Amino acid sequence: MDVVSLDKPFMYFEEIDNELDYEPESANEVAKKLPYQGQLKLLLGELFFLSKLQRHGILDGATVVYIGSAPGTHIRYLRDHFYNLGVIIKWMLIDGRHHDPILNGLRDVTLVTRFVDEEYLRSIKKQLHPSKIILISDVASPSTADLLSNYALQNVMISILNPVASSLKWRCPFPDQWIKDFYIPHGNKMLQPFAPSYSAEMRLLSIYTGENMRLTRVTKSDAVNYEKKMYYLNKIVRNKVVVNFDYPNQEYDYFHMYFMLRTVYCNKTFPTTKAKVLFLQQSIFRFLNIP
Amino acid sequence: MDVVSLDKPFMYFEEIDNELDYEPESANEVAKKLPYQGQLKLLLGELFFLSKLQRHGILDGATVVYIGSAPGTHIRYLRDHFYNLGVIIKWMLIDGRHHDPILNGLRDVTLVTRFVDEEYLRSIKKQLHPSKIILISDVASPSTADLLSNYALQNVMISILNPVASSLKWRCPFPDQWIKDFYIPHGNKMLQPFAPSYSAEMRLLSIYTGENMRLTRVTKSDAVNYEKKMYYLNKIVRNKVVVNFDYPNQEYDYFHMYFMLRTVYCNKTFPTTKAKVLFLQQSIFRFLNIP
Numbered sequence: 001m002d003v004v005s006l007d008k009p010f011m012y013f014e015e016i017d018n019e020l021d022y023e024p025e026s027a028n029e030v031a032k033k034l035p036y037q038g039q040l041k042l043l044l045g046e047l048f049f050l051s052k053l054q055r056h057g058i059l060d061g062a063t064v065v066y067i068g069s070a071p072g073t074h075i076r077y078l079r080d081h082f083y084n085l086g087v088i089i090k091w092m093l094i095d096g097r098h099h100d101p102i103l104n105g106l107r108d109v110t111l112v113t114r115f116v117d118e119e120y121l122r123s124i125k126k127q128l129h130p131s132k133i134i135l136i137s138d139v140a141s142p143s144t145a146d147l148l149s150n151y152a153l154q155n156v157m158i159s160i161l162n163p164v165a166s167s168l169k170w171r172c173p174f175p176d177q178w179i180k181d182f183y184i185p186h187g188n189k190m191l192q193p194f195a196p197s198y199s200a201e202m203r204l205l206s207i208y209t210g211e212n213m214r215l216t217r218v219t220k221s222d223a224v225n226y227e228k229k230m231y232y233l234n235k236i237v238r239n240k241v242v243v244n245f246d247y248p249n250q251e252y253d254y255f256h257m258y259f260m261l262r263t264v265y266c267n268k269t270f271p272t273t274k275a276k277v278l279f280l281q282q283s284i285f286r287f288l289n290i291p
Numbered sequence: 292m293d294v295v296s297l298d299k300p301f302m303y304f305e306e307i308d309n310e311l312d313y314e315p316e317s318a319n320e321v322a323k324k325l326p327y328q329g330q331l332k333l334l335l336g337e338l339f340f341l342s343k344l345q346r347h348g349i350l351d352g353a354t355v356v357y358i359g360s361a362p363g364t365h366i367r368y369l370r371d372h373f374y375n376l377g378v379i380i381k382w383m384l385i386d387g388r389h390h391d392p393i394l395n396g397l398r399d400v401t402l403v404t405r406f407v408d409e410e411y412l413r414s415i416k417k418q419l420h421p422s423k424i425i426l427i428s429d430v431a432s433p434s435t436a437d438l439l440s441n442y443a444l445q446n447v448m449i450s451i452l453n454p455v456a457s458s459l460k461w462r463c464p465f466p467d468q469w470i471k472d473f474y475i476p477h478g479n480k481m482l483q484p485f486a487p488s489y490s491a492e493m494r495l496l497s498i499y500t501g502e503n504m505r506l507t508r509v510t511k512s513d514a515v516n517y518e519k520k521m522y523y524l525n526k527i528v529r530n531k532v533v534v535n536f537d538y539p540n541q542e543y544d545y546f547h548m549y550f551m552l553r554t555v556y557c558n559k560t561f562p563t564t565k566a567k568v569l570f571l572q573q574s575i576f577r578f579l580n581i582p
């Protein structure tokens with residue numbers, strides 16, 4: 001067995017303190033070990049993100065515009081959670097594809113069937129006015145050309161919508177398929193437990209203050225660094241069993257999930273952080289039909 | 292006479308502490324009172340800008356890429372000044388129109404006849420590599436649509452060229468002809484003596500550190516503010532004779548010019564700041580054929 005003792009897991013990309021030469025043969029390795037693993041991956045990051053905004057008092061009264069939301073099965077759990085806590089939020093789910101019917105019949109959630117473009121964004125901005133917007137983007141079409149197009153659309157979402165905070169999908173293109181340098185919004189690069197086995201995707205979390213918009217340049221050398229750091233995390237780190245982790249599941253991903261869930265608010269009071277997390281995790285897995 | 296005593300002039304937009312309702316009839320008022328006033332306006336701001344970079348030690352060894360440089364008569368003076376001081380700079384002057392022949396025959400200055408576009412920018416970036424770039428942009432085609440296009444090209448210059456510093460042309464569109472909000476690079480909004488009588492144009496001065504690119508949003512309310520502050524400066528302030536200004540010319544514009552010129556370096560040593568400025572001003576006017 002691959003045992004180890006750790007204090008805390010890597011929460012952000014910036015914390016990864018080691019690298020490994022990427023081995024392309026990793027691509028043919030099992031990518032997922034859980035049913036609905038993708039909905040789980042998304043639920044944990046968005047709960048982590050949204051719970052943070054709650055702490056800063058910027059969630060209540062906001063309209064959450066989620067683009068690239070279909071099917072969005074996991075979003076029902078998110079909506080229920082904050083709704084049951086007494087937080088007032090209006091959800092606007094926009095995708096060209098159709099959403100899970102469990103999302104129907106809620107006065108607080110609007111499902112829209114439209115692939116957004118710059119023009120459409122301006123239209124709903126006029127519509128939403130003057131509500132505070134929190135943007136979540138999970139749009140996917142990829143090639144380097146595809147990625148750059150998605151990232152270009154994401155920067156457009158922020159400039160037009162002018163959100164108070166955002167969560168964007170972020171995977172650096174492969175250095176060997178570099179096309180050109182580009183800018184992405186400045187923000188924390190949140191790591192994702194339960195991401196595919198060798199995925200280099202993370203979630204860019206930003207909170208906007210004033211009229212300012214700070215971007216950061218990404219070059220090929222940056223791309224080599226992403227590739228090596230993420231390959232080290234996937235190949236070595238995520239394969240560890242954290243034995244000093246007092247929890248029914250000691251796999252690194254559960255250890256990493258624990259640190260995200262411990263930041264979540266519940267109505268029920270728990271004697272220990274361990275009780276709250278086991279409870280939230282049980283609740284999340286039951287909702288998603290994960291044994 | 293319209294007399295007054297002032298400590299210092301307004302150097303940046305942010306210093307303007309008053310406003311006036313813009314009177315559209317101002318547009319038919321005499322815009323310029325000096326021959327070659329536009330070359331003078333440009334020379335003072337670029338000398339001010341470049342002399343600052345010299346102070347920060349970021350001028351020597353750089354390549355100055357000036358887009359929208361034709362005819363560029365005043366640029367010969369700029370080139371001579373730093374050249375005579377011993378600073379090593381390569382000038383690259385790009386415009387679809389033709390430059391003043393006084394710029395020919397200098398090994399340190401390259402004249403290019405091309406209207407730049409995004410593709411061309413990438414091409415000269417590859418060319419210039421690995422020289423440090425200082426960008427100066429004076430491109431003009433305006434309508435609000437025209438302005439937005441120019442500003443969009445200017446942001447493209449920065450993202451592709453990735454300069455260490457930049458000077459960009461900046462005039463906020465009229466609120467009554469608003470089309471849509473846009474972002475401009477963050478930087479000091481340098482005011483310009485000898486600008487047309489009622490011009491609301493300034494020069495955006497930025498110094499870049501790291502891979503970061505900070506932008507700022509401009510809305511219609513911002514546009515109303517620009518219009519009123521600049522109209523107050525043009526109508527009231529620039530029409531003053533600063534009597535406590537010990538100088539052969541007490542017009543506000545000369546008082547404002549003095550503060551820019553006092554920051555310029557000369558080989559010749561002067562007993563007083565007044566002697567240096569009178570000398571530089573004499574030199575500048577003689578070069579431009581201004582009495």
Ligand SMILES: C[S@@+](CC[C@H](N)C(=O)[O-])C[C@H]1O[C@@H](n2cnc3c(N)ncnc32)[C@H](O)[C@@H]1O
Nearest residue numbers: 068069070071072095096097115116138139140
């Ligand atoms: C990875 S899937 C999203 C999964 C979703 N976030 C979830 O919770 O199930 C990416 C999605 O982005 C959507 N998409 C692609 N381009 C889009 C656009 N311009 N507007 C809206 N959605 C788009 C696709 O239709 C697809 O449903």
Ligand SMILES: C[S@@+](CC[C@H](N)C(=O)[O-])C[C@H]1O[C@@H](n2cnc3c(N)ncnc32)[C@H](O)[C@@H]1O
Nearest residue numbers: 359360361362363386387388406407429430431
């Ligand atoms: C106000 S004039 C510039 C004056 C110049 N800075 C001087 O020192 O004399 C604006 C100029 O921008 C140029 N211009 C317009 N679009 C351009 C582009 N895409 N590439 C280069 N120059 C362009 C025009 O040809 C014109 O010469």
